[PDB]
Design a protein around this ligand. Structure first.
Ligand code: NAG
Ligand code: NAG
Ligand code: NAG
Ligand code: NAG
Ligand code: NAG
Ligand code: NAG
Ligand code: NAG
Ligand code: NAG
Ligand code: NAG
Ligand code: NAG
Lengths: 341, 230, 214
């Protein structure tokens, strides 16, 4: 017997003490070594209720990543309201590593194993674990990168899909590589992201068909964000310590959902020195980019969407979203919850 | 319960600067984008500015043209609107507004698709080069050709004063029925001009006395003008 | 960048009526449209957001519709508190924008204005300025045109006007218009006329005086 409960988890990782890479440095001090032989066991006949949207595991991870970024990517100049914070801002080694979250004695983590579990409600095939899988604390908007994949069908996650105010997390079952590059020796800030238009469009078609299941076979339309901060109108992410802003207009291109658009999609990108902080703490200023080839190849494993709505309309329009980085952690922690003995 | 309280309103010379503030309470200040909307005299609502929850970005209506600046202080839940190089056209009531998004999920980032759910009472900004001045009061004498057995009109022209308001009564408040005191107009001189009229039976002219009592507190001016026919 | 155009500019209603205000965007804004009410003395009040969502606390007598460029606000069973100015607002672009407004006043029987003209007082003329005032009293509807004429020459640029709020008792308006000339220009002419055009008048009414006359 047990009950739902919240407790201070501890983290584990395979961080290396010799590394100057900032995730390794944080994890070396914050986390314990992983268990080379962890204990997972199926629970014979147990049905437990999960709620990914009300999971305190998400809050703790958010706090850790904020802590990590505070120590690792401190800006040259931080502007928060009416103050100006100057700090050393040397170029550093930046490449996220997987972080496991673990329960202390007296608690355990229940893991949902239903193949098409959407994140809320009952789970019938349940197991208990010591720790979560390795989760890379990748901070991004619009596109979820380097995450896990859904095992069976594409999964549409939402607190309430009929409520258009609630964010949508699309969990892909096949990843699409996005190859971002700031080339070396005009504009040192000019970059670009390359995607296999054939792989992407086919996945986007699958996402469309999956959305039709939930929305009465209505026409599914994709549109770019109509406006707002650059960090959410663009695909915002950090590559090798540099802050990228990529235009995803071409990714959400309904024409390819048969014109000959099976080629390479090249998204225009920009590295910015001045950014709005996802932590909510004003704006940050960094030094101009390092010299040479800046390159990050990532797996697109999920998508953040908002639905326009409309009282009756024949279409449903979706736009890339994100900005609340807690949802990034939710897309990985959705199948876990803490209980007390 | 959401409460928005503006301050910093008042007078300012054209080309001058003025900072408005909005003290917020009754909600989690750090979670919400905040903004400003104005309404100038005789005009409609105008989108002035919004700043994101994180306070690192702000966006402005087309008329601003780089003249305004926003900032927010999370220690005291206050939003500021610094206005520079103001013009007479910027004379308006400025409202503090809270911004709510149609969609959750943007965290502290500002996104299009929103509405102004909560409004402050507004604060008046007057951009003028004029100085405090009392009104001249002139009679609007009833027409000698007034209709026989019908109704005649008479009044007082309250001209060239600053700032608003003036107050007008007739016969020390005795005469109220038929009285119309009009909204002031701002003259090209920068001074205001106002009229107050009353309709009376033409038979009462030449028998009944009519005095308009004009009061302008800013100049401490109190005037009484008898309006006689011819 | 996006212009919001409301129609009509104004309309009259009785208690119990149903009225519809329309809003047109110069380009597609999906359902990113809000409606506000504004009454004198109080701040704007949100009615509808996202084209169709009734804001908490607002009477369900208000409803919104539309998607794309054409939107409408409907007020069913009009109450006295609904007589106000109404504004649409797009939030589609980063910077939003408002419509020019549509006000709803109380319907009554058409009433033509009682028109009066006042010459400048000698008291004022002594200061070197001449103000000629024309009064349009207790009329309905609010639309009225004043045309100043000096020696039958149509004036423009040298007059201002203002209008009272709709009267709480008889639901009428009054309008005052002031023609301002220098003393020099005033002495230089004879006939000063105020020509009033109003729906309640069969044809335009003119009230005038000659400068030198009792
Ligand atoms: C439950 O699902 C997991 C994988 O998600 C699988 O390994 C396990 O076999 C399933 N349960 C049973 C009883 O097979
Ligand atoms: C998720 O599954 C639960 C349980 O059947 C259901 O109540 C909920 O509506 C589902 N939501 C979505 C978005 O599929
Ligand atoms: C992914 O899921 C879709 C249904 O949502 C299915 O048609 C497709 O075959 C799946 N692909 C893989 C690789 O599992
Ligand atoms: C989900 O959203 C719809 C539409 O907003 C609403 O009617 C319904 O009550 C919501 N469901 C829950 C469980 O809140
Ligand atoms: C990424 O793109 C660059 C330049 O287009 C190319 O040289 C590199 O091989 C690409 N990497 C992958 C993994 O496709
Ligand atoms: C994209 O992926 C497909 C596999 O579905 C492959 O056939 C195609 O060659 C790829 N595009 C390239 C390599 O440009
Ligand atoms: C993204 O690209 C499209 C097409 O070139 C352009 O219209 C849009 O303005 C771009 N977005 C930004 C934020 O510049
Ligand atoms: C969609 O892709 C086609 C390729 O045939 C291109 O011509 C069109 O401009 C694209 N539309 C976008 C990116 O909005
Ligand atoms: C995703 O992982 C790959 C391989 O570890 C790495 O090269 C890439 O930079 C990662 N992407 C991000 C956005 O961290
Ligand atoms: C990412 O994509 C690469 C290329 O298909 C694949 O080898 C790798 O296993 C993927 N990783 C994850 C976590 O999906």
């Amino acid at each position: 017997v047990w009950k739902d409960a919240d407790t201070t988890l501890f983290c584990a990782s395979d961080a290396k003490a010799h590394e100057t890479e900032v995730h390794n440095v944080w994890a070396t001090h914050a986390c314990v070594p992983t268990d080379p032989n962890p204990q997972e066991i199926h629970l014979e006949n147990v049905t437990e209720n999960f709620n990914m949207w009300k999971n305190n595991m998400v809050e703790q991870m958010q706090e850790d990543v904020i802590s990590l970024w505070d120590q690792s990517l401190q800006p040259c100049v931080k502007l928060t309201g009416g103050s100006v914070i100057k700090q050393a801002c040397p170029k550093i080694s930046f490449d996220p590593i997987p972080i496991h979250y673990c329960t202390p004695a007296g608690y355990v983590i229940l893991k949902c194993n239903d193949k098409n579990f959407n994140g809320t409600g009952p789970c019938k095939n349940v197991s208990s674990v010591q720790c979560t899988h390795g989760i890379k604390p990748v901070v991004s908007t619009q596109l979820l990168l380097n995450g896990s994949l859904a095992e069976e069908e594409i999964i549409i996650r939402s607190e309430n899909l009929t409520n258009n105010a609630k964010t949508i997390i699309v969990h892909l079952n096949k990843s699409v590589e996005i190859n971002c590059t700031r080339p070396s020796n005009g504009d040192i800030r000019k970059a670009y992201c390359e995607i296999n238009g054939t792989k992407w469009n086919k996945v986007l078609k699958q996402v469309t068909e999956k959305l039709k299941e939930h929305f009465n076979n209505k026409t599914i339309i994709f549109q770019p964000p109509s406006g707002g901060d650059l960090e959410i109108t663009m695909h915002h992410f950090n590559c090798r310590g540099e802050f990228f802003y990529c235009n995803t207009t071409q990714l959400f291109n309904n024409t390819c959902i048969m014109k000959g658009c099976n080629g390479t999609i090249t998204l225009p990108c920009k590295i910015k020195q001045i950014i709005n902080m996802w932590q909510g703490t004003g704006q940050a200023m960094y030094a101009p980019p390092i010299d040479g080839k800046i390159n990050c190849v990532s797996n697109i494993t999920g998508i953040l969407l908002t639905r326009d709505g409309g009282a009756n309309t024949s279409n449903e329009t979706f736009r890339p979203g994100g900005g609340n980085i807690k949802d990034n952690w939710r897309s990985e922690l959705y199948k876990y919850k803490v209980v007390q003995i | 319960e959401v409460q928005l309280s503006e301050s910093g309103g008042g007078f300012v010379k054209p080309g001058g600067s003025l900072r408005l503030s909005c003290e917020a309470s009754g909600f989690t200040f750090n979670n919400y984008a905040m903004g400003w909307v104005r309404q100038a005299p005789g005009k409609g609502l105008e989108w002035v500015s919004v700043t994101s929850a994180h306070g690192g970005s702000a966006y402005f209506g087309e008329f601003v043209k780089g003249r305004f600046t926003m900032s927010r202080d999370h220690f005291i839940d206050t939003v500021y609107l610094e206005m520079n190089r103001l013009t007479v056209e910027d004379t308006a009531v400025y409202y503090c507004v809270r911004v709510t998004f149609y969609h959750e999920g943007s965290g502290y980032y500002y996104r299009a698709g929103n509405y102004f759910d909560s409004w402050g009472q507004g604060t008046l900004v007057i951009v003028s080069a004029a100085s405090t001045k009392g009104p001249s009061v002139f009679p609007l004498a009833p027409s000698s050709k007034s209709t026989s057995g019908g109704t005649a009109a008479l009044g007082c022209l309250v001209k060239d004063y600053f700032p608003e308001p003036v107050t007008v009564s007739w016969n020390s408040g005795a005469l109220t029925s038929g009285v119309h005191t009009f909204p002031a107009v701002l003259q090209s001189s920068g001074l205001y001009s106002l009229s107050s009229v009353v309709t009376v039976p033409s038979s009462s002219l030449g028998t009944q006395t009519y005095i308009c009592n004009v009061n302008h507190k800013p100049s401490n001016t109190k005037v009484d003008k008898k309006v006689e026919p011819k | 960048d996006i212009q919001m155009t409301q129609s009509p500019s104004s309309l009259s209603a009785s208690i119990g009526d149903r009225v519809t205000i329309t809003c047109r965007a110069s380009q597609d804004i999906a359902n990113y449209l809000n409606w506000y009410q504004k009454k004198s003395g109080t701040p704007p009040k949100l009615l509808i957001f996202g084209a169709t969502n009734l804001h908490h606390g607002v009477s369900p007598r208000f409803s919104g519709s539309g998607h794309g460029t054409h939107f409408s606000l409907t007020i069913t069973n009009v109450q006295h508190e609904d007589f106000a100015n109404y504004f649409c607002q797009q939030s589609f672009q980063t910077v939003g924008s408002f419509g020019q407004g549509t006000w709803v006043d109380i319907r009554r029987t058409v009433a033509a204005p009682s028109v009066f003209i006042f010459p400048p007082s000698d008291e004022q003329l002594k200061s070197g300025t001449a103000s000629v005032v024309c009064l349009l009293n207790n009329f309905y509807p609010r639309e009225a045109k004043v045309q100043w004429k000096v020696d039958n020459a149509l004036q423009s640029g040298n007059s201002q006007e203002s209008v009272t709020e709709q009267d709480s008792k008889d639901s009428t308006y009054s309008l005052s218009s002031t023609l301002t000339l220098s003393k020099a220009d005033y002495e230089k002419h004879k006939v000063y006329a105020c020509e009033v055009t109003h729906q309640g008048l069969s044809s335009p009414v003119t009230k005038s005086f000659n400068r030198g006359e009792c």
